């Protein structure tokens, strides 16, 4: 089994609220934990790049594949590696060559854990 699958990303949905948006959950196990007992930042980065790629491809509907070009993240608050996080996305730019996703990672109390921007290349 690969990394994407073991991340356990659930309830992924891409929807126009045109303003494109996505939402998803990540169920947290030992897989996601760093040594100190918190959610690994690398897991959160992976979640954002993947779900942004998934969301861009679903908008294209056959016309192009999404390929991460750049990513920026700020880890704001520590999340103890338990339960789940929500990754919610907003499409800032719906361009010809690029997609720019603003992504918020929140816990079950809606505390912002990470803010992440993903630029996808459209190939």
């Amino acid at each position: 089994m690969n990394m994407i699958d073991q991340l356990n990303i659930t309830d992924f949905q891409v929807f126009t609220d045109k303003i494109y948006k996505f939402s998803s959950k990540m169920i947290l196990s030992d897989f996601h934990a760093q040594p100190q007992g918190f959610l690994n930042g690398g897991a959160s980065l992976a979640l954002a790049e993947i779900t942004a790629g998934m969301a861009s491809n679903a908008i294209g509907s056959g016309q192009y594949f999404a390929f991460g070009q750049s990513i920026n993240a700020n880890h704001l608050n520590p999340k103890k590696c338990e339960g789940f996080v929500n990754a919610r996305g907003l499409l800032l730019k719906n361009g010809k060559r690029n997609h720019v996703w603003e992504i918020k990672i929140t816990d079950e109390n809606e505390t912002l854990i990470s803010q992440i921007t993903v630029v996808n290349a459209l190939v």
Copy 2:
């Protein structure tokens, strides 16, 4: 087998240059490799960027902790990456770091992810928070 271990980070070493010996501001670097399998793949058969991002944050954290040694523990605060060239998900990549700032509260690492031919795959900057 958590994500960290499944990443298969190999040959990790943190070091200073021999030149920095008699200077006050030591130049810190790290080296490592990541051995690729399907675990690291994205849908089109290339190295997934999430794996490279995770490699950068994890090795930077390991390097920071090694430099501090008991003094502090390092926590990922910030990460910026630019994916320059595609890497087919096979063989291995190198992750090499240069410490741009050895601050009291933050470490800033400049990290180059390179393929086996030294072609730059991803350029990544990691800011670590330093905890007592």
Copy 3:
């Protein structure tokens, strides 16, 4: 007149909902123009760092001054060097030594021009 003055930032206010937000305007003229006639992205970068710093300083009430630590910007759409842009911020993190500002720069049609995140170090004064 320094760069800050000549950037012509008007209507700056920081307001609470604590959720801290700010809004402001940058009035465009020849000062802000790049050679093709567009708003210079460098002017927008500057606008974001300065207003984030202005907003943190207003929160600090003299106890500290904000120093720009890291900035991440995406220039999204072109803006012709005329009229004005809005700079609106949201405090993502109200930390004891750092503030993290999410700043959206939009034209007068609320078309998003640039999105910028700014981390300020909070240094005791």
Copy 4:
């Protein structure tokens, strides 16, 4: 005078090294560049990076395309007093057909790293 001119960017040059593209430049400081505590305004350094990256990209594609800053990432590592000059040196990490990625180092008179900034330029035909 506009912002670009008042920034006072001097000694600008683009060159190749051991096909690796690089640029070199200076910015001489007055109180134009200052923030309220007497330090170099980070915003001036940001603008320096975007401008020089744009100038350097345009000097390479002269004039197939125009360079336009797409994304910029900056870490301001060390404060500088707003006096003297800074050096801005860029390295082309990726010479794409559609994008350039410049790694830019802002250092002081003695080559102490003040800010490290990465500029991604969009390469758009003209026409």
